C-alpha cells in the first residue's frame, strides 16, 4: 500500500537520510580503540558499530548500502527521492587534517557516484571538514559545482567548537556565493557538555541531540548569522530542535539580554528570533512523525518552511509514512509538506 | 482590558510559579562570588541579579526581596489573586556549609510561612530543603505540611551537579509522597560540567540553559522510574513542560528503542510510555509562555486539567501577558480550569 510514482497527489521526498562508507566507521573504530574519541563517539558509535542487537545491526547494514538494497527499501515505503549526507560526526571529530579531507573528499566522490547512477532516486548534500574552513570552502564549490549536490550537512560541533566564531566564516561566504543551503545535523555533544546526560543514558537522539542541536541553531540566530548573510538558509530536523516550541521564550528571554548588556556576544539584531524563522530557518520533521507537532510548526513557522523526512536508517517505519499520508491537512499543505517545499529549497 | 482582582471575568488567577528572595541568601551568593567558591552558573545568574546596574535587575531584586504591600499592589494592579510562591533558584542548595544550609533556609520557610499567615487568601508557600542533607530535607517537608502550612516544595533542580534520580535522594520522596504532596522542579544553571558553551553564547540562563537543565532532570527522573516506585507522586515543571511535551514523540521512540537494543544499562524496561507518565504523573504550568498556541498543544498532550497559569513574577511582570492569557479563544470552562481550578486541585487549596 505504499507506493512510488506520486500517484496519492505528491511524491515523497525524504530530506534527512544517512549514509555511511566503511573507512570512516574503521577510523571511528580506531579512535575508540586508542582513546582519542571522545565520550560521544565512545556512546554513539561504539553502539551503532559493535552492538549485536537488531536495530545497530540493521542501521549499520542500511547505512552502507548506496544501491538497490537501499532502493528496495524506498520502494517499500513509497519514498520517491532521498536527500543522502554521510552520517553524523562525519569526519569533524578527526584530529589529522590531511585524513579529513581525504575521507571527506571520498565520501562526498561515493555520493556522487551514487546520485550519478540513480539520479531519479538519489540526491546529495555534501560533507565537509571545518576544522579545515578554507578548505571546506573549496569543497562546497566543488560539490555545487562539480558534483551536482545542493547544499552540505555539517554534523553540529567540531571538535567542541560552534560555527559562530569568526575562525568558520569561510563556509558561509561559501555557501553565500554557490547559493546552497545548510543543514544542521545533530551530533553527540562535546565533552564540554556531555556528562550528565550520558550518565542517565540522554546523549543521543532521545534528548542530547536536541539539546546540542537547538544550542547550535540559537548561538547562530544570536550572534547575527542571518543578519551577515540575510540568504542564508539553514535546515535542522526533528521538528526544529524545540526551538518552534519555544520560541514565545526565546524571543522574551533575547531581548531582556539584548537591552540589560547581560552578555557580549547578544548584540542587537535586525528581527526578531521569531522573523529569523519565518526567513532564514527551514525545519522536516525528521524523527517526528507526528501530527500535533507538525502543524503547530507549519503555523509558528509557515507551512512553506516545513519539510518531510524519514531519518531512514535510524527510523525506518512503515507505519509512520501512512501517519503522516492521512493527516488532516489539505491535498495542497501535504504536497507542500511532501514535495514541493523540498523542491523549493533544495533547488531541485 | 481592565485586569481585577476578585473573579468577576469568571475564574481567580493562581499565579503557580511566583519568586521571593531573603536578603541573607543573598549574601551569600555575593560572598560565594567573591572568595570563588560559586559555580559558573552563580556567576552569571547571581552576579547579574545582585550585581547588575540594569533596570531589569534592580527591579526584579527589590520585588523579590518584598513579601508584603508591595508585592500585593503588584498583583492586584495585574489581577492576581493567589500566588503560590517559593524561594528563587538555586535556594541553598549550592552552598557547601550545611549548618549555613540548613539554617538559612529554615528562616527562609519562617519568613515564608509569617508572610502566608498575613495574607492568607493571597500568598501560598511551596517549602525550600538542602538536598545536600535528604533526611533533614524530609524533616523539612513534613514541618511545612504539619506547622507551615506550605502545599508542596521546590527543588531549584541539580544540587552541586547532583540529580534527584540518584538513590541518595530518596528520603525526599519518601516524605512527598508521606504528605501527599507535589514537588515542583524548578530550574537552575547546569551545573559546571555541562554549563560552558552555553555560557559562552550568553544562552545558560532562562533563554535556553534552564530549560535544557530541568528538562534534562525530569527525564531523568521518569526514566529510572521513579513514577513506578512512587505512582501517587506528582511533579510539576513550568515553561510549559520545558520542551517535553513537544518533544514527546521522539522521546518514547528513542527510549523504547534504546531498553529494546539494551543500549544502556541505566534504562530499563518502565510500567508506562513517556506518554502514560505525562498523563498520570507530571503537571504544567506556562511560566514565561504567554503564548496561546503552545498552551492549547501543551493542553492537548497532557490534558486540558495538567496545565496550569503562572506568572513567573518578578522575572517575568507583564500586564499584557495576562490579558493575552484572559482572551484567550478558549472555552470559559477550560479557561478556568487553566487560570484556577486546577491549582485548586493539585495543590490541595
Ligand atoms: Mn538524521
Ligand atoms: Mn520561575
Not at 76 to 99: F, M, N
Not at 107 to 133: E, H, S, W
Not at 251 to 256: C, G, I, K, L, V
Request: net charge negative; glycine share 8%; with cysteine.
Amino acid at each position: 500500500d505504499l507506493k512510488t510514482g506520486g500517484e496519492q497527489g505528491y511524491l515523497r521526498i525524504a530530506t534527512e537520510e544517512a549514509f555511511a562508507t566503511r573507512e570512516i566507521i574503521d577510523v571511528y573504530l580506531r579512535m575508540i580503540r586508542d582513546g582519542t574519541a571522545d565520550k560521544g563517539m565512545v556512546s554513539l558509535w561504539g553502539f551503532y558499530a559493535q552492538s549485536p542487537s537488531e536495530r545497530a545491526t540493521q542501521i549499520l547494514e542500511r547505512l552502507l548500502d548506496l544501491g538497490e538494497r537501499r532502493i528496495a527499501d524506498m520502494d517499500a515505503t513509497g519514498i520517491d527521492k532521498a536527500i543522502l549526507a554521510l552520517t553524523s560526526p562525519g569526519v569533524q571529530p578527526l584530529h589529522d587534517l590531511d585524513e579529513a579531507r581525504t575521507l571527506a573528499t571520498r565520501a562526498n566522490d561515493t555520493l556522487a557516484d551514487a546520485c550519478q547512477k540513480y539520479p531519479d532516486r538519489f540526491i546529495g548534500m555534501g560533507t565537509v571538514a571545518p576544522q579545515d574552513p578554507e578548505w571546506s570552502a573549496r569543497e562546497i564549490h566543488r560539490g555545487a559545482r562539480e558534483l551536482g549536490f545542493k547544499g552540505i550537512q555539517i554534523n553540529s560541533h567540531t571538535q567542541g567548537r560552534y560555527l559562530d566564531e569568526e575562525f568558520f566564516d569561510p563556509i558561509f561566504r561559501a555557501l553565500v556565493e554557490v547559493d546552497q543551503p545548510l543543514y544542521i545535523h545533530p551530533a553527540t555533544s562535546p565533552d564540554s557538555m556531555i556528562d550528565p546526560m550520558l550518565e542517565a543514558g540522554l546523549d543521543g537522539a532521545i534528548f542530547g541531540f536536541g539539546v546540542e542541536t537547538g544550542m547550535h541553531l540559537l548561538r547562530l540566530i544570536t550572534i547575527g548569522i542571518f543578519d551577515k548573510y540575510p540568504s542564508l538558509q539553514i535546515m535542522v530536523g526533528h521538528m526544529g530542535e524545540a526551538l518552534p516550541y519555544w520560541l514565545y521564550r526565546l524571543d522574551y528571554m533575547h531581548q531582556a539580554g539584548v537591552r540589560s548588556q547581560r552578555y557580549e556576544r547578544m548584540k542587537p539584531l535586525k528581527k526578531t528570533i521569531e522573523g529569523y524563522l519565518k526567513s532564514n530557518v527551514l525545519v522536516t520533521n525528521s524523527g517526528v512523525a507526528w501530527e500535533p507537532a507538525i502543524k503547530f510548526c507549519q503555523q509558528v513557522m509557515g507551512e512553506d518552511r516545513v519539510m518531510y523526512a524519514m531519518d531512514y536508517p535510524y527510523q525506518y517505519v512503515a507505519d509512520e509514512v501512512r501517519a503522516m499520508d492521512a493527516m488532516d491537512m489539505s491535498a495542497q499543505t501535504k504536497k507542500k509538506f511532501f514535495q514541493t517545499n523540498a523542491e523549493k529549497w533544495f533547488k531541485l
